[PDB]
From a paper:
This enzyme catalyzes the reversible phosphorolysis of 5´-deoxy-5´-methylthioadenosine (MTA) to free adenine and 5´-deoxy-5´-methythioribose-1-phosphate (MTR1P).
The mutant Q289L was prepared to investigate the consequence of the lost H-bond between Q289 side chain and the nucleoside observed in tubercidin SmMTAP complex. The Q289L tubercidin complex permits a direct comparison between structures. In the Q289L-tubercidin complex, one BBS is in the canonical D230 conformation. The kcat/KM was also significantly reduced by 43X (Q289L), 303X (triple mutant) and ~2X (double mutant), thus indicating the importance of Q289 in the catalysis and possibly reflecting the importance of reduced flexibility at the end of Helix 9.
Numbering used by the authors:
A (entry chain C): 3 to 235, 242 to 294
B (entry chain B): 3 to 235, 246 to 291
C (entry chain A): 3 to 14, 20 to 291
The structure:
């Protein structure tokens, strides 16, 4: 049986994706999650929603308790996490109103709790060195992309399509994010450096969320919402564009939950769990 | 109504820029500043001076309470902050004894309190996401540059002058800093990587000071003092640098007092309010 | 008189005894093994403790280095498992590093400061060439003496690279861990020109210089990180399997290096190490 957790970012502080059946006010061994967890169903598929920043968007990116959010969803029996992440574009073909189903990242965060494990008494016992070459659940990424196709949203894959298929607004079928600490936005100098490294978007919340999801044995995928060009490059139209983006992502998320529930995930879930065990350095040395 | 704060770095642990009127021992919601704050007048312009590292320079760059220093200057009524920052050059044209009126940076610091706002009880309530594309106050940058001209110090502007006009010692009219955490200096490998990224100087103290000044609604500009080439490639030179940076600061204070800042001060304050995402 | 400490990586003589020490900065990773190589006193310290329970970001580098300083060590030889970012550095090779790029954070990386849990002072140490060059060349000559190939990219051709070899120079990026790198990070580090990626070199190398000690690292290439094919992407089992095979050569190099160190006069080098610390004391 699957159960899909949803971590909603900017624009999803108070989602209302389904009829609320129950609420869970919980804590974890790592502290309090960002807010109450909301339980319900998309069709016959159990779903749990949590706003990354809390209902009033009072928690900044560096202070989000990523460990508690991921562990709370694990404790409720989630098998998957779908996340939204607002971002700035570093590249001309990613324009405000587009989305990116990320497959890669470069980490420039610091000072955040980014692992459940360690040698101190307040972390889980053991040492975990997780492979992160392709850090998302690929099967779940392809679900997000197919959900966009099913909801009549353009999909652009630069590996197989010419630039003529980059029709806006579109879901970019791959992409890399730099995660910065915030809360300040980047300088023009930083933006040009990240662009020169070949990164596609900049955001403040993907890491360590994606890392902790893999440590928890959960299938994780992010859909990033391009809200503007970062500073390497009217306001009423911007806010309206973001509103329309949120409507489209809500459509993608609900279709994605249905598509996840339509398939069997037994082997993928067992492989998620086995990857955690095989990454326990303290167990493999003995 | 303007009042100019001055944060003195290396070579400015005990500046004595003017006859002291008062000495302020203050606290802030973020702790105590690096030292007492000295207040007085330069001409008719009110001025406040604070040594970044304290009188004895006993506080290393990663342990400076940037939040307390900036907040204390704001509390005493400062509208502007002028800061000095010692640095190493990453570029052939920036030689020891030159100064740089910075306009950009790349941040490699960690573990420092870099914002006044958050969700924890030790910060002001709110989520503040400040634009930083051009992170300095441009009017105040141009004041530093005009102050150097008024004191007959060479200015080199790469966008409008040939390289043959780069006559040393000179004030470079623009430049980018990488801020590293310290206390160690860079390796040759790190210096070459920073150079290849296009950065001009390396220093340990610019960030988060520049960021917190904008959060506090203040106009901030830095003058960096090139002390040596960084290791991709002195005391007597630095003493002469301090003498001329002092002249620049004192002239810059006079020049700030010579204009109206009403709309810039208003814009500084409104930018903070418009950057509050929780509101 | 010289005395060589050895800080041992993942899978880590005439043993006299085992010693527990305390330090102003806490307890070292584990007890220390005291002995001799010939007539040269030697002390061995595992970086991660006996059960390998301490991850790289939580190793007490300050206590490990200071413990060896307090026992009278003049030299530290260190091993560090790593991933290769470059075609000619292959699993089973070794690198006598001469450079690094630091991406660690949150680790205690200096003995000095203004907080009560550090020594009083402000120490700004030069780090242009952050290793002891004399000791680096001892590690390379030790490999020659044990019939292990040495590859110098300054003087030799890729066609003349014979494996397993000790690479006579190289640069490391140190990441904080515990996770391995993404493919995107791996390619960015490769494009910066870095040779290997590891998690334990920094701040160990920096603190050794703060302590006035001669320090050199021999990195053990266990994998190609993750910039190559999917079957070559790093994981714990891959690191451990190659490490177990390479430690035999690393032991031979280290034991020979200790003998070579004890056969030379180090009076002025040691004086220079200490004088570098004193001249970096800005508060004085
Ligand atoms: N250009 C950018 N650089 C960094 N972060 C950005 C953007 C655009 C959006 N975000 C995300 O939105 C929030 C800040 O408004 C943050 O929560 C952040 O994740
Ligand atoms: N080459 C360099 N790299 C980094 N920092 C440098 C230099 C040269 C000067 N500084 C600044 O001066 C102090 C170090 O003595 C520190 O306070 C620092 O800001
Ligand atoms: N490809 C890689 N990236 C980062 N670190 C790596 C490797 C390969 C090995 N190591 C080092 O070995 C330990 C991880 O098990 C860690 O202690 C680490 O120092």
């Amino acid at each position: 049986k699957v159960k899909v957790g949803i971590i909603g970012g900017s624009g999803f502080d108070d989602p209302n994706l389904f009829k609320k059946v129950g609420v869970r006010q919980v804590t974890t061994p790592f502290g309090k999650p960002s807010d109450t967890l909301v339980e319900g169903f998309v069709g016959d598929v159990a779903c749990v929603v949590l706003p990354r920043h809390g209902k009033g968007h009072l928690i900044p990116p560096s202070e989000v308790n990523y460990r508690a959010n991921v562990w709370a969803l694990k404790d409720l029996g989630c098998t998957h996490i779908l996340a939204t992440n607002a971002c700035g574009s570093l590249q001309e073909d990613l324009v405000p109103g587009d989305f990116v189903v990320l497959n890669q990242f470069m980490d420039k965060t610091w000072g955040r709790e980014n692992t459940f494990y360690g040698s101190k008494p307040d972390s889980l016992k053991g040492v975990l060195h997780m492979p992160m070459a392709e850090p998302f659940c690929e099967r779940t990424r392809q679900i997000l992309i197919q959900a966009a196709r099913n909801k009549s949203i353009n999909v652009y894959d630069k590996k197989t399509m010419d630039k003529s298929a980059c029709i806006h607004p579109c879901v970019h079928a791959e992409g890399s994010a730099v995660t910065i600490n915030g809360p300040r936005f980047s300088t023009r100098c930083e933006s040009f450096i990240h662009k020169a490294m070949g990164l596609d978007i900049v955001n403040m919340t993907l890491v360590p969320e994606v890392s902790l999801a893999r440590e928890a044995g959960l299938s994780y995928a992010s859909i990033a919402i391009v809200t503007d060009f970062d500073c390497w490059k009217c306001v009423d139209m911007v806010l309206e564009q973001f509103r329309k983006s949120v409507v489209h992502v809500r459509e993608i998320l609900l279709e994605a939950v249905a598509l996840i529930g339509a398939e069997d995930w037994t082997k993928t879930i067992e492989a998620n769990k086995a990857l955690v065990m095989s990454s326990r350095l303290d167990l493999l040395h003995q």
